[PDB]
């Protein structure tokens, strides 16, 4: 199948037998997408093993794939094999089963339901301000990914189940341990080169995740049916099923974990290495919330510079890195024939740093998203939450959760680079958007 | 997945782990379908390995699956794995690709194209009458499956390519050998129990058929593009592709081989063991074609008792044995919920011999199809060529080919049981509708 793009007239790096272009991933997904974009231009193809992948960078064509032809042609993501009951998860379901799940979970993520969760999420921001203060009086630099990781785990366990716990101070609560139970492991690289071996894993009872966890979850869900994501899904039954509920809650946990704390780590890195932005944000936060006033839903949506800082961080670090859709049928979009079975991919990371649309894209400059310049930004080039009907359903929730944590922490602390701070920051090598070395910063009380 | 039918409330034989009910195939597919129909009634489920299979016998429900909901729900047959370029064959293609092939091959099988092939098919009936006459003067019983097999191979090579050859007398013509190059092999049983190992075969270059054949075919197709199935497909290009042409011609050869000669063997067995029917047919043949007159398209459609004999043989021996459709989506038909992925199966063999619709079904009685009693026959119980949009596209061609051979042979010979004739006939054990022992009969010249 390695002759597909050569017969279509699509440029791209010459693939090797069996491997495709996977050896070119040695620089990471991001650098490979940027390099291909430089040498091949607007459209190029490559092979993940035998699987052809067509990258597209034209906004009109991106709009067609993500919006116009979502239901008709580009409905599903890459099927990373049938690997268990997780087929009922909304991010994984396909075609009519996904639409059913999307329709049943959309009212759960309204702004009305989000405002109801604001008082709950606010309590743990105060729990956050106490934990890092203990590690701030220690005089030693703080690893943010552990206080943020503790905060992130606190919020999702209470917003999706109602289990109010201080994780960093309760090492093993029976729920913290089972929730706390490496995406840079060679296994994921072998699955792409051996997609035919996925059926062997599915029958060999090599279930995704241990059956100690998940079984702990379905039992916990049963005892909680007698404001959070679970109650909204329980009341929706009063349709969804019970094992479907466990599947969605699993997605929310992975969603709200290594995205929430990672973006917060990138944000605090940018604020520490740009003190003028940090003070400007603190002056905005103190102006809206005088004397460390508690942040509310409406006061958060009142802070413009906070939104610009969050958006500029997500440009430099789009934690999804790529958007993908599988071509359901032979189609032709915006001037080219897309054959069936090809994976169409939008390289978000490379587009966010493309000088075709961004001035000095390596620089952290929040003013790109000022109300003067947010007009000149194509929504199909800047896609931190995707676009179209299958975009990030938890975008509003994620933005609100991160901002509430930013406000409470910046109302109390300033952040500066320490001896151990990796400057400039390097991105992790092999497939997840995270710092190479964990971010460590000096923290001081205001 | 072995608990599917137990949760649906559908009866059936208790499956074993991993194997399902495949051990119950020791009596053959036919006996297993009859036994299940006796003990479980109108609807029952079983497991081919992990694959659930739901048998249905209600005519209204059969009409819904084959006709009403063909495009919407029950479009495709069981995907016996992706096992090469044969995915472009009409009997194997799925959904929109099958409709395209069906639409491009329908005009090829009209009665107008069939009448045009009558003079060609007629020549080899005369070639047939000479070969078995040589083995008739030998005074020894004749194995029909070899003179019929030679005739069957003659007709399809000339109706799909234009290669006029006497196979039995030309042992190795470069085309006869490559065309002549066991469906009761244990391999097919292992594929059902190990459907996850099919992807390994597809990548390990264990192609279906040797690459000596097929490569001989695509090269032969290229040299023939400068009345038969090929010309009608070549002129249709003037759309279809060239490797698609090789795929369809492969299906026609398998179609016109072990079906044409097998049914003719069953027919001659019934005519030999029922001499009154044989003489009655010979008296009809001589009445329409006086003095061994050559059979034509219109004279063949003029013989009513010939049609009744052919139809009654196809009732006792429906060489397809089963019809199958894959349930594309969660649906409810005629009072029961059919979940996605279940294989819905119509047990044609068991329905053709069901005393609920047939008086003494073991008896060969052509009068069931007299114009008096062909009214009382449900077309969804007697399904020798299937039904609905995905029925046998070559039904008219197959009926005409067999009848022309029957007429010419019966105009010259009578058939009687020999010492070596297996009476009563036993069906082959393991998956193909063919005699256990090959049919041998005494042949005499009129
Ligand atoms: C900074 C935080 C987050 C970012 C940057 C982010 C980004 C994304 C992106 C880029 C996609 C794919 C969109 C596409 O393919 O077009 C996505 C999908 C999704 N996200 Fe997020 N996400 C975040 C947090 C969350 C959270 C907190 C939740 C839920 C609690 C969530 C739930 C989902 C779901 C369910 C999908 C799949 C939706 C579907 O397939 O219909 N995300 N996210
Ligand atoms: C006595 C001779 C034959 C019998 C009893 C027979 C029977 C059948 C049956 C039962 C089916 C499946 C129908 C269904 O699933 O509803 C079928 C399919 C088919 N047959 Fe035949 N067949 C015969 C000869 C032929 C011949 C000679 C050809 C072509 C030269 C042919 C071409 C096909 C094709 C292409 C299909 C699949 C059609 C599709 O999927 O759209 N058959 N046949």
From Swiss-Prot, chains A, B:
Changing residue 90 to V: In allele CYP3A4*4; significant decrease in catalytic efficiency. Heme binds at residue 392. Changing residue 366 to L: In allele CYP3A4*13; lack of expression. The lineage of its organism: Eukaryota, Metazoa, Chordata, Craniata, Vertebrata. Belongs to the cytochrome P450 family. GO terms for biological process: aflatoxin metabolic process; alkaloid catabolic process; androgen metabolic process; cholesterol metabolic process; estrogen metabolic process; lipid hydroxylation; lipid metabolic process; long-chain fatty acid biosynthetic process. It is a single-pass membrane protein. Polyubiquitinated in the presence of AMFR and UBE2G1 and also STUB1/CHIP and UBE2D1 (in vitro). It catalyses: an organic molecule + reduced [NADPH--hemoprotein reductase] + O2 = an alcohol + oxidized [NADPH--hemoprotein reductase] + H2O + H(+); 17beta-estradiol + reduced [NADPH--hemoprotein reductase] + O2 = 2-hydroxy-17beta-estradiol + oxidized [NADPH--hemoprotein reductase] + H2O + H(+); 17beta-estradiol + reduced [NADPH--hemoprotein reductase] + O2 = 4-hydroxy-17beta-estradiol + oxidized [NADPH--hemoprotein reductase] + H2O + H(+); 17beta-estradiol + reduced [NADPH--hemoprotein reductase] + O2 = 16alpha,17beta-estriol + oxidized [NADPH--hemoprotein reductase] + H2O + H(+). It comes from Homo sapiens (Human). Signal peptide: none annotated. Its EC number is 1.14.14.1, 1.14.14.56, 1.14.14.73, 1.14.14.55. This is Cytochrome P450 3A4. The gene is CYP3A4. Activated by cytochrome b5.
